[model samples]
Target: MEELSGKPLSYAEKEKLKEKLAFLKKEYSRTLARLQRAKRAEKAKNSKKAIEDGVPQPEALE
Candidate 1:
């Protein structure tokens, strides 16, 4: 990786960076949970539609 050309971070700057990292980690978890919830809702909606339209069930084979 190419090193960035900049002055080294001071103590305060390092603390701020750590805080931002923690914030983004929590943000990621929240977004992932929301996405999973949406997917589940969509699946339930599709299933309901299929039931209304008389879609054939797939045959199960052992």
Candidate 2:
């Protein structure tokens, strides 16, 4: 393939690069935040179930 002087990107390449980077950043941040929330939700659900069954929470082991 022939190379252009300095550096050159096609208009379509520039647009696609911008779009892909934006999508990746948004997806990464959203997934990271969601992971914490999801983990907490699972813990809360288990706690609720234990409470319903009248099971006492165990003491933290040293």
Candidate 3:
């Protein structure tokens, strides 16, 4: 759902857009600050597969 209608944005439109961007932006920031705790998660639960695998990646302590 992106750019289906390309045109100038309404003032109010940008407001809501920024709202979604807030969470969406917060969700995954280029894996920089994002990779810290957020990315640290999936790396965590991977233990099941990691356990069976040869190497289990360690977690960064909170």
Candidate 4:
């Protein structure tokens, strides 16, 4: 790796930075938020059968 010191950005930087921030925010909301909601949702809906045949769900081997 190489290193350098601080330097100023061009006038285009602020706008581009904002675009990047907004893009990430939207992507996170659309991709993960509801995806996790569905993951958690189905568990409650169909989780009983899984536990009914449980073997102590080693998911917590601690």
Candidate 5:
């Protein structure tokens, strides 16, 4: 990351970056859980073996 930024940051700046990273991680987990629940609900309503194996619905590709 320092290589990309082309400079080194002090401890305080690094701590702030870590805080932002933590927030992003939490947000990603929450969003993934929500999507997983939606997929499970759809699978429950589906009769196909593909859905049971967690494959995307045919129309979902487009």
Candidate 6:
């Protein structure tokens, strides 16, 4: 099916393509969540390291 990319697909081929699309959508969501969690962990680790080293914290008016 991939070999004939962009060409019109028959009914069976379309069904296969649809199935593949659903699988990719779920996989993409899982990967995105994993990436966001990793980002939060990295930021926490960096902030903790800076605090231990006596870095000046940012002053905010909020």
Specify the highest-TM-score model's number: 1
Candidate 3 per-residue C-alpha lDDT over 1-62 given as tens digits, one digit per residue, 9 for 90 to 100: 47767688889988988998897876667656756766666756545343454655587678
Clashing pairs in model 1? none
Which regions in candidate 1 have their CA more than 4 angstroms from the true location? 1-4, 40-62
lDDT of 5: 0.81
Better of 2 and 3 by TM-score: 2
Encode model 5's per-residue lDDT on 1-62: one tens digit a residue. Answer: 34566568889989998999999999999999989988877856546454356566578656
What is candidate 6's TM-score against the reference? 0.51
Error of 6 at 60 (Å): 52
Model 2 lDDT tens row, 1-62? 56567768889978988999999999999999889888866855444333355567588678
Per-candidate clashes come to 0, 0, 0, 0, 0, 0
Worst 10 residues of 2 by lDDT: 43-52
| Candidate 4: tens digits of C-alpha lDDT, residues 1-45 | 234367775579768878989999999989998889878778555
Better of 3 and 5 by lDDT: 5
* Model number with the top lDDT: 5
* Pairs that clash in candidate 2: none
Give per-residue CA lDDT, model 1, range 1-62, as digits (tens). 34568979779978988999999999999999989898877855444333456657578676
* Model 2: residues with Cα > 4 Å off, grouped in runs: 1-7, 39-62
Arranged by lDDT with the best first, the candidates are 5, 1, 2, 6, 4, 3
Error of 3 at 15 (Å): 0.4
Q: Which residue runs does candidate 5 get wrong by more than 4 Å?
A: 1-4, 43-62
Question: What is the total number of backbone clashes in candidate 6?
Answer: 0
lDDT of 6 at 24: 97
C-alpha lDDT of all candidate models, in order = 0.80, 0.79, 0.71, 0.75, 0.81, 0.78
- Evaluated at residue 52, the lDDT of candidate 2 is 56
